[model samples]
Target chain A: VLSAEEIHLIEASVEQFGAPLLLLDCDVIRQQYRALKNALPNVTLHYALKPLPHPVVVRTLLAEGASFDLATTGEVELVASEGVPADLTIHTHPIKRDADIRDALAYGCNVFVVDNLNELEKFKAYRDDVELLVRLSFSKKFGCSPEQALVIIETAKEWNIRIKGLSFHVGSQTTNPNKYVEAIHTCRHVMEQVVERGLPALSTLDIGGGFPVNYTQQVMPIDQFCAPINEALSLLPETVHVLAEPGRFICAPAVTSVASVMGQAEREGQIWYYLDDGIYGSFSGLMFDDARYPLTTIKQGGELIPSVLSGPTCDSVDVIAENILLPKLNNGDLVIGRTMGAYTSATATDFNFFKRAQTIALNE
Target chain B: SQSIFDILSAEEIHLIEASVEQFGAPLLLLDCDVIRQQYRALKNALPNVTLHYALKPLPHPVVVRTLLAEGASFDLATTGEVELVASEGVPADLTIHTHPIKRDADIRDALAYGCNVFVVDNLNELEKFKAYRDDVELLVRLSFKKFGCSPEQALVIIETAKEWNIRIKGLSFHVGSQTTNPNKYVEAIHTCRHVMEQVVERGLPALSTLDIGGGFPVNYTQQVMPIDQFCAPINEALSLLPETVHVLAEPGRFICAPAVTSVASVMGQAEREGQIWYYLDDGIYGSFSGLMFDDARYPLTTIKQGGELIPSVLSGPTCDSVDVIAENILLPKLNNGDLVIGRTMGAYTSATATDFNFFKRAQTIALNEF
Candidate 1:
């Protein structure tokens, strides 16, 4: 959500720097962290570093008292270069490449999430006295069942490593709070099983991050979503230290993708507006989960009409949106895509010689 | 003529003497002889079967000409595929099969070439086609649901065509490729027959053509179907099919996949984490397109070594992280500047490639013999 004055400044900056530059609200982000800290005083807020890796964003998060959750060695190294403490960071990728494990150990990363016995063995061989958390997969959408959770717990017990606790992600962009409730019940059952097997140190429970952001009117409110977690945790072990990694909640809705209309086409009674930046820049999450972003017309004040939005790339698959309701636009028209901060530009492909979008932080 | 592997090797050594040599990096190494043999085998088995090579899989001129010479027809989805064949003197009529909805330029090109057999997906597309060009023989494509491995959705697709009154000449269904059960085709043919019966009751010139779209698997590793095991499904379908309906298949990968292989020279290595990352000149932009990290699609095998291999991450020369060709490829540990060849990079690799960061395309050469 950007104001008219701020947007005007962004448009002026774009005219100065050229089109396709990322406008980050640094002041808004600083306020966002302060609000989160005030709301959840007991819990530690870990910033999912994969979303926005701008050094300015990282430095601001570090200054605002947020920990780091890294998925790759490159990310870990990036955070470490910013002088973030190693103890405050956690490596939480389910499928850990062997290279990532070695780098984590070399960089003194203590917290590691092990999903399988093979990973536990790798962690055991790499570091001494390191904290290990077993990551469990939730959601029937991904084909993970309760029986599979039992198998993972059993494998971890057999390895007999320095186990910290258990963690689970209830998939990304989930609107229903009941999904978290169901996942918590699953986590409790697994934790009880681990404790029954004589592992006394299983006192930490990381309700893994997938805190939903307002993608559309379909998404549930954050307060309503977190209500189930509060209720469900009371039923679990009292000694457990509760932790959650909220990626979309923190980053999304804070940043907007500013793109320039490069070209337009009309075919078979359908109008197509080709943007210079595509799924690669602002709409990458749409490509991954088959989701859609709300497009707002900045130049014209007409009623929103559905039009197909495409990328400038030659590939037929590089489409951003099909039949999207937006204001009538022309070439060089500035448009902003709401909530593109998380995972959109991070996983962008350099297909067809399109340069990666430059991220610029806006300070109030 | 040198094989693609030979040309790549010679080019790497700076020994490619002729300027006429195909130097497109990530090029399909199509063996014209193997394709001809496959076409001949299909013709020999079912003399009446119309063999349409799905040009989207591999559209190299040498392979297309070889199949055309063997009396094979074309099933083109794009204007580029149609152009590839027509430029080499393949008659427009010989390219009988065309998709319903296409780019305006592609549609104009197909109509201009007198390719009458058109497959339309929806009423809107049919209306659009009618508006574009009239007096063209068209087949309404069925929107059938693919359930239980059968292309049941093709039935729904055919019904849409019947409702639009778009000159239904034939029925078509695409059972997805690498299907585990061959009996799916039996269900698909049964669905097609039911659609034909409806077409007849509606007085829509009782269908004369049935196109069972290509999903015939080729052995990539141990996963794909063996050639011997593939014929049973087709033979079974033929035995159960009616005499009035002429059968056609658009086997794109089945013809080109086994005939071609891609090789890239390892440029350097970087020690990331504990494991060695072998950086190659070719990437997802080149040979390993459409493959995810976990799928293990284009598993690189060391051609020189006949022994066991270690699991290593194969990265491309591009600076982007998504440019990874393959991860955890179980190949023997080799030093810097080792050549690694990936099988089955011929299909979707070159067509969707980009010359990113000024990286030249891979050279393509036809293989005269295996």
Candidate 2:
């Protein structure tokens, strides 16, 4: 959904391509990435491919010198197939199969994450060729006690492998930076204790993603959100490098979804405008990520009436919004679902044989 | 069904071992044989009503074809659905487009594909087909206590269609899916009969069909009351519609939910907040989409052997916290590579699953052994 001028741009795009389309504005992606980067200039921000992992986002961030956060074999192949620099991308998913290790290593990636003794031992065969990052979450925490860190470091030693670094993720869409600062200080202590125990000095300290993004109420701006985090990172030993994984904040505002009114019904007292895309489609962010995007139509000029917007599917649960104020809309009237860059299309389905929205990249 | 039973036997598990090796985790082992059994159960439960398989749940070609072999009819609402049933060489007369609203093109496409009977809930939809009066017939849809339009409003559509010379063949109503109360169907059927009599009293063309639209419940967690008991009142209500009216019902989830069993392997495990978080190769965006979308609660268990049960959390493949499958369930500790199967996942599960994170929707492997 766009302004009059932007709608004209979208109008042409649909004429050239078609409806149920996801317009990925690369400019937005670039702007969001640069904003987060400026917020935490010292930290290496790895673009987690969990939200929007399209080739366009990958290539845009790749050109911007951003790293990647990979969790599964499919994600590994996605980055590898796009020729992402293996060294620049880190395997942050601490738990993996032996086959997962072989696959990532096969993609020229050597640094992997490990959280438990079982995971460290999983890397025993690849230890000669790879380095492991002992994640502070074996049972769970962003920062392990010195005793726990010592156990992981000693286990790596028993396997004759070096603990490349430590990492922690304090949930996503986090509003405060205190948890981040807390983890930072604890990780610093763990690093000092581990180095004191004769383990080689750590290199990268991975700070997991939880950067807040705007939804209904205002969220902390990335710059201010990272200010305290910046102060916390300064407390970390200079020998340890700072790394951050920003999944939602980077991609959430970079994409917009456009779905036309497929049909309409006045079954529930209110006008139910069924769009070509629904909660099962690009609007999946509504259900999957616990996100509610700003929705509006480009059309202007009619008395606004309370309306229910449903998906193209017949399933009652496929309803998008049970009540929304809307002017009169007919078939072919376009509906814009904003801030849909993350978790929407990435989680879309082709149920009822309806094709998922055709993603169109713009401003490349 | 056995209590706390393993849905798939060791032999069936061995049968699909090769695919487990080839495609790896997050596969939906669909036994098409179960579809035939569910159909038979529904048929035995309500012998008088014509069962039209609502394809929205899981419209796999294997399902359409299997149901076709079982002499099942279909409920189509979209062009995509029309194409699916048509591709299977299903007779269009056996299918009806049940969407309450559609575009001019949607009507034309469904008519072109041989779906002649379409549902129209209001005057807008009825007016949509004045152009196709000669080509397609109509089923006036009525809303229920929870969802659609009122029965009185349906008569207005019937009266409005008279001027347009549109043939209103029947009356249809959806009482909402997973409907538990038998009185809902009985109440609806009783109301539909009154509408039919009111149509006759007006000296209008006799509408001889009554489509009791789908809302049949399926057991996801606990055993639902038997279908026979569920249908007993519905059968008596349909009998009151006079021997002249044809009775039809569209059933989707009931037939498909039990047919699918999702098999996903634990790709990774993380300990969080004193709970075990077992991340699968699939989640809400993928095979477990139903858990989020349809508000489904699927039964889950790990393939690994016994351990002291602990509070465990199941998460999807993605990094989003909302991608979690379940929480606070007492379960044996799941490790990397352990398989987790969700029973009665045949319906809305894969039908709405997305290929997010490039984690594939559970690969559907159908078994018939017929």
Candidate 3:
């Protein structure tokens, strides 16, 4: 919880600078980073750049010796332009464009991860000398299963390309940490089989990002979250470097969105607060993830009621949050969104010709 | 004489009417008179102040020509903006504000046309610019920490440019748009001066120009700062600088705000909780992207007949529940066929609109002539 003075300072900054600024607390991020480091001291934790690619935020995390996990060529280029070595940066997206692979390789990015056989052949065409990590899609509904993973590995072996490790993602915002346990065990059995087949160098295991942040009441704490992982990893010998790409957990709590209340309306006894930003400006993740942001009213003295908070865009799909409970907000009322640090602004659409959300660092 | 209510005052409604009349919407409604007035105003106030209209905001051909005629140059970010302006017969010398780096096509166009002054931000971008070094002039963009006054993310941009050894003729920094702190320019200009000194020490030519990028304030709801108040810190910074230095600004929204409006009509309505709910023909798909639910810019103004003012939810024509425009707007009771106006829809809104759910685009008109 922020102190009264801290909240007032933030509110004052929004009032003075206009409401598109993302107020980030350095201490909160430091605390989260320390907590994660304490949980898995040996695992290489890569901060996912897709969540919040703000240079200052990325630089702050990098300054603390955190590695970056980038999904797109633009993200990799952005970090590379900042003078961070491309080798330290992991190309972690499941899908990659051909141009992206060429650019990534040109930039000396050897640590590339792939999920399918098609990608293996593509990479093999470029340079067989490059190190590769196989990305396993764990979701049977939307992604590939362990059988698909075996095919991808065997295809790499057939091409005589070196497969350094195995990786799998449980999906973003997973409600259960046991999902990670299940994924790790499945991946471990596959690794043991690869070893039995004489692939002695298959040592690295990447447990891909899905570390949930507390957006609503549905989120679990990092300690309770990592308990199952600890139990699962405890059974296996520590021969390989364990990796986890947690995008949201490091970013979400550090930043809050300050939006100006454009106006409000009531329909069926439900009130709605309108803000200057929309799907294109700040809440880009809402469109991509099909998620709704939780709202906390910044202004005081409005009636507490069920409301729909939306963007100022003319599009119907521009709504940011729905069925939210907030104070009866009037024109000029400001609303600050909590836990919006990840995946909100990075993927923002320039659809409304809206400028990117401005960033503000909290120095205390 | 027609009253303000008789004709549609909102730009969205005018756009819809125009779209219905024509098939598609115009990309820009260039305010020729506004361009002339701003140029003359800046000229009269500071004769040496170089004006470069940033084309990323609203790049129309007429606007470019009008600015060129009024002694304003062009600031091109993308290759598209540069090509558009250059097509209007504006000379390469007149358009000195090139983006830091360019694509292959942009480099070819600029080099072929002899656009001497080019801006570069990072070492990689500078290296790319170095390939065209003998072909054109180079200007290095310095990232200043607008400290707490501006977004801190841009500071890293400055540090990246400083590490490069490529030839740089000038320096630039953006204070951002509609920034409340007028004092931010003080820190920004000071940072530019410091960077310029470092460039001079590196055996490069003395930085002759300082492109103080635009964020000149406009009256969105209440007037944040008068034009004079906004320019005070900038003028003061100039006084402290060397006489050899030239100043430039890229004002977009400041010139376009009063010159355009988006008018939308209520297409449908539903009564709920004894209050009227009006759904406009526009949605996020149309031009009203940021202002729909944004309570700050376009507060609901009820202009219907004998309408008692009550809290109402303004929705878009889309079937999605997220397509709401304004909420709890205090307006006279409204019904279908009524009109609502969205002010300040001139700049980014029209360009960023999507054709989602088969919704046609909005119409555009020159308000200065209207």
Candidate 4:
């Protein structure tokens, strides 16, 4: 499935650097960002740094005039060191230590998120300096209910904390567009309650990241996927600014993994090909996220055989694919895993003393 | 219903609190005293066996220095580990490289470090040592699962190794990790004993060693048998083998799992679904990665002593919902800065941790290192 040029690039990169490399192309990041922007024309995009926190992604998005969605102190320092303006970023983790707040505020990012009374009370000290966003949980992880969202806003107002907007994540890899529609309608209702209570007007609505991307199965095109979400935003008041935290959509397809076959063995009617990277390396999305990446070998024109792909760990569960159709591969042949930029390398571990794949930035 | 309080003493509690007060929250308090105790317990249980401390569980240099001071050998699987031990002044003769799969660099890296003992489970790996055949002695590893060859295949691999002039050091097999059943090792030992007898009966050179690899269990939520009781049956199985065949074990978790405790401070809180969710700075992607990777359930407790217990969920600091550590657990009401302690957290906890979501991994504070 690889183009002639892609095979050439994969081979050439490995020749220069060692095996087990992640070829991160910034051109795809620009293309993906433009595609999502065209899909939701009015909503401002904040590139979430959780999925792929590499600096090239930040530099790419910064030149595209995009903002950032930060969740930790490391991310705040990442953007700040990259010369990103503090106004172009928002801290969206629903939970924080006072140190987390102070670190972000020290970086000149005064915008933060809160979901409960405890989170709101932490902002009392910085009420005059910060603008708060009340996060509503559409998922089970973080955030509060719609009723509690109102309570958080009311309590923040009493503490003289500026409640600037509302935010919610429909879910990660959220396939249904209607989930966003429903979340938008709920946020609109909460905004209505804010006006009726004679509280300060909320100006921004942060639609947190959950956009899906294709791995083994094809997904809806970004333009078509965001059409309903765009319509939902259209119903909101024009005075309320809209922002979307797009993490995986912009970074997932921007990387292609190149790992060498460390060793091979024939076992139980299948060839077991162990690679230099596995679930503990760049393919960690297999463990932490729901991603079955498209896999292929650079070797062509061999009769396909059933094979099992494994990581370089001694652990039994480190296999990547079982009963997969792959050409007969030898020790040191290249295996390419596509659509691996998002959560793969970001969550990789150095278990069994195997090193993580060194990322090579391309087409910057 | 074992609890973390049952494991930590009041003095240990003061140490944890004081450590957090000095170093911030989300800390791993590595007790060298506990490590030495566990190692000596396993050694006493298997008096004749050579104990090699595998570095896969907790590979801190301090652990290596402590174990070396205890006169323990080492099991290495990678170049990084070889470099770690070599830098810490460990004698290369006291170490063995056990990873069955290898590249040329991996083989040469170990050979250059004077570690001539290597392990192989297949013909392809045995062939890898052809260039260094004069410099190496290989262990034919038999498999119960993933890495090693089958017992039937081990004979074939040994036959192939002889043709290639590779020195078969003896036989090795892993019963499995955290293996509680003594019969499992008993069965594997009998199988390996048969293989060794067949090798000598077939006019082959006598194998000199049998590595019954590590899977030694420790108490987590469930209590395992005492180490001496567990190894008694295993020692009886070894009695069937000739005394000329030296026995060895690579215990990674048993010596390390109970040697460290985890301390994390509550960062924030929220009420949802009638349970209080207290978020800590360290979660699954940090030191608790074993919960996701190894299916480990460490005992949990809080530092606050006497408030009425409430239903609470302990969550990690990451943005992912999958990062929750314990759910529907009863705990006293915890404030923003209150500390939570996890017991039996030494093995596979920090070793497999990631800096995901940019949440910093917990810093390990080695105690009583001398």
Candidate 5:
């Protein structure tokens, strides 16, 4: 929900930029970055841009002495435009087209990731300019199995390609610390196996991101969540640099969604408040399987009744929240969704010509 | 064991390859001939009912122009669509605004465009039109579930519209899309007939039109009933109504699903867990979004042929893991830049696609326009 000051800021922003806006507070971004950084001090923090690739989010984290994780050519251009130093970013996409490699290299980023021989072979030409990270699938849509990672490393040696380090993503929104602990141990064994074979010792161990964050429910505190993870990282040799990619945990709660009730209708004893933004808009995360944002209204002192929140689209599947309780609202009343910075607007579509909400940065 | 070569002729593959060479990797080859054929098929099936091509699924100017040349009306839902049909020189009288929810501007915008037929489902919506009652003839949309009014609320909405001196243009209901069974349409038609008769018997102005909203099924991965056979029962139901009652149907997918073919080149490849995974330039976030939004599985095939079929997976060009298109399928090993073709991709596929990872959506290349 919103504090009095937040409500004032939301109302003021709508007045200036019109309704259906995302109030992105850079203050929260700084706080989230500091919290995650303090939690995993030993591990280098790289803000993954896939979740929320807003320029302000990138700048906010950059000023906080954070590194970056990029996946696409567009992400490279995004960071490059922000005047980010190439040395501070890693290209973590397990797969890449030749152009994707050329663009990142042109932007001065030399570190790239690969999980298969086919992908590694593509880098044979740039084997001199690039340092490859053999991504281990602690999980298959992307990374390779631990057994297969050994083969990728051995083949990279034969191809005369420099294998910088190994990387692994447990999963998105990975809740248990032990998942990270297990993956770290597996990578440790892989590294040990490589050295036992008289291969060059790996200098960096990149821990892929799946850091959890609170949405409608509370997750383990960031400090407590990282305690076990830090313990796991402590076992690694000091010469091996430990890096982490955090997307959702750093940006999920940094923005608040403000949607105006474009229209309202009562159906079957529940008021259906149709907002200008919907599943096809900022709430596109609804289709991402498990995003249920905390919804509230700015109206007060009215009887709370069962209501439904809908997106302003012709499609029936565009409803956002069903069987919600809220005070009676008017056509122009404001509805707020909290913890909406991550994956919410990132996947939005302009379906039915209903445009996505314009984001307004606060505390910049 | 059939490859895309079996489904698409050699000539078809040549055209697809030629288009991709000129237009780039991800492209939608929209054939106007298929559109004209589908429109003619639906018009033949529904004989007397006026066909309004709904722009919700693939609102391309080519489809609009192709359908318009076939003597089709339009179903508009937003001001952007209003501006579209208006800019295309479509007559205002031949269109209807069918979105149940609206702001004042949405109503005013359509009215200003001279398209006065509007849809309302509740008292609040009915009251919003009080100012424009003289300029509008409203259709009371009946809710099958989320949108529209309930069967019981139809009479109330009609009476309220009458009290407000607003013209009631009969009623409309969408009986769920891709409806395989005709029983649902029969039941909904029967219910609408009752409501229409109740309005006349209660001394409200006789309802003049009944809009049977679009749900016409088409062949996707599995074959659905043919359009002619599917509409036979619906034709009988419509026949039960008086000749004075004008009938209309808004068809989106049936007219557009088979009209467009999606072509995407394999961007890269990887071997994981005993299967080859080939990633494409376009995926669920692009033209194949129907997989996530509409739960639609389009018929997929590859241009490659005459090789040992191997276990493989198809993925989109996003970092998101859920963006994979097909899995556990047997296909000839595809090299980088091999084309994968998707059939029946003209409907919700491109309409709801997003440029999520900055990977651009497929550009529509209209062919056979003349």
Candidate 6:
């Protein structure tokens, strides 16, 4: 699953760090960002910091003039610590505490997101000081209908809060362009009603992140996926600026997860090779993100047979992949995983004294 | 058992409220007194077997020091675990390196820690010990499938031991986790007993310790057998073995769970898809991570009682939808600040949690530290 350059880089870097490393290529990140940029050229791209929030990732996107999507006070602190300016980021968590609002505001991020009447009222304390994008749930996933948006707009108007625009997420791994088109038209219809009902011109429409990435199967190319989205988005008033929160598309391919074999055993006519990392570590993507990363061993030429790869943790649930064709592996052999950039390391745990995969950025 | 009625007392809920009030919600309360009781209960049930507390479950320092005070042995796997117990003044001699497959670095560190008893499962691992035979004894760990090892492979391992002049002192085996029955362990031990006799006849080192590795079930959605009943067949099966042969068991989930409770506060509420959704301050990515990873579905309750019960989706505080903890759970109308408690969560709950969205893992408050 590795490109020639990635393979070369892994072999070279494996000599420095131990075998189990998350090789992050900033160049791949730049390429992914520009590719998505070229696809949705008009929409302002705010890279959500949830998937891969490393300093290198933050610095990479910021260098590309990419804005950021922050969901928590911790993310606010992270971007602040990374020296990312507050104006370039928007706080997108629809549910939050008063302290969360105060913290992000303290960090100088004035824009926030709200989903319900209670959430809208929370911002009334500083009505003039902050602006909110009323969030809507779609198909019970991330957006709602015209009546709901109308109620929120009327509520915000009554509460004396600034309703800058509307925001929504259709759901993740969206393969159909029609889904994006439907959400856009729905939000556009809501946008027209809010204006007709006598409100100040709404300035922003947040098409929340759900852009798909190639994982189990290849997805439509980024440009092709965004065509229908861009066309439908073009119907929005020119006065309204479109924004998106893209998480997976720009980051998933930029990281290659690696682990080393710590031990081997023969079980059920197959070899069980335990890796230093597993579900508790970087492969948490398998459990949390519905990810199934393509796994391959660096060792070749040994008699290849179906082998069971398990995590180094004593927990039986730590099995990574079962009955994959693999070479006879011993301690210290290498295994690599692909499409691991998004959720794998982001949600990893240090359970059973097995540390998460140490990350090393390349092409800095 | 069915369930613990007194599981949530006013005092406990009051304490949880104070913790959330002072710190925040999504807290895990670890009662050291409960740890002592669970330890004592397990000890009272299987009095003959030496119980080594496996740190993989919940290796909090308080749990370690408390267990150490009660004179419980420890199961040390990685060097990170060794450092923990060492900081607590737990002697390495009292700990066994039970990881069946180990890295050379792991073995080296354990050697320096004075852990002479190490475990191995394959021929390659046995050969790796050629350099360390003078320093370590070996325990062959088997997965329960007929105690199945070829005589030739065993002889091959034994021949390598002859080079370094070290002998296999014992054997260990594990039936997988959350195991629902005692029959597998007994079957494995019976076969291990036969294998042990033959291996002794093969003239290896003095065989003594028989480590029946951890898999003892804990009651989750349903109650497992009482400890006495569960141990009956195990004790009878072990009675067939030599009395001089020491008996050891590595029980993690059984001992570690039932000692901690996960408490979360409803951060907010919303109606979605004709159902009420109560988002909790803590979620699967936080302390309730065991629900997704370890196959432990914790029983939940809300402080708000007797309201019209509604189908609710309990979600984590993270923005990611994948962080939803439980779905289609019927519960009372839990208002914001109403407490939700998940019980029998001591085992894998906190161990596999991550601070993904900056929701700090549930704060662990000790009920009886002093």
Candidate 6 lDDT by residue in tens digits, A1-364: 4577767778888888886799998998899989988999888999998888888999999999999999888889989998899989998888887888899999999998877776777788989779889887654534445677788888888888888898888876788878889878988888888777788768999988778887768889989999989999889888899999998888889998889888787776888888899988898887887778788866667678978888888777778886688877768878999888998888989897876788999888
Show pairs that collide, candidate 5. Answer: B143-B148, B143-B149
Error of 3 at B121 (Å): 46
Best by TM-score: 4
Q: Write the per-residue lDDT of candidate 4 for residues A79-175, one digit (tens) a residue.
A: 9889999999999988988888999999989888888899899988888889988889655778888899988888887889999899988877888
Query: Which sections of candidate 4 miss by over 4 Å?
Result: B1-7
Better of 2 and 5 by lDDT: 5
Say which candidate scores most in lDDT.
4
Better candidate number, 1 or 2, judged by lDDT: 2
- lDDT (10s digit) by residue, model 3, range B315-348: 6644334556666677776644466766656555
Per-prediction backbone clash count = 20, 3, 49, 0, 2, 7
Residue B369 of model 3, lDDT score: 30
Q: Which 10 residues in a row give candidate 1 chain A its minimum summed lDDT?
A: A139-148
lDDT of every model, 2 decimals: 0.63, 0.81, 0.64, 0.90, 0.87, 0.81
Looking at model 2 chain A, report the run of 10 residues with the lowest lDDT sum: A137-146
DockQ sort, best first: 4, 5, 6, 2, 1, 3
TM-score of each: 0.56, 0.92, 0.51, 0.98, 0.97, 0.95
Q: Top model by DockQ, which number?
A: 4
What does candidate 5's lDDT look like per residue over A1-364, in tens digits?
5689988989999999987999998999999989988888878888999889999999988999999999888899999999999999999887777988999999999999998898999999998899988888763687887788888888999999999999988877887889899989888988888898878889889888888877788889989998988888888888899988889888889989999987778888899988999898899999963688888888976788999998999777889998898988988899999989888888887687776799999899
lDDT of 5 by residue, B1-370 (tens): 0012111898998999887777787889888889999999999999999999999898888788778888999999999899889888899988999988788999999999998998888887888888997899988888656788887788888877877799998899898889999778888888888888888799989999999999999999788888888999998999999899999999999999999899999988987778889999999999989999889898889899658999999999987888989998899989999999999999998889886767778888888767
RMSD of 6: 3.4
Chain B vs. true chain B: TM-score per candidate: 0.82, 0.95, 0.81, 0.97, 0.97, 0.93
- Indicate the residue-level lDDT of B67 in model 3: 71
**Recovered native contacts, candidate 1:** 0.00
Q: Which 10-residue span in candidate 4 chain B carries the lowest summed lDDT?
A: B1-10
The candidate 6 chain B region of ten consecutive residues with least summed lDDT is B1-10
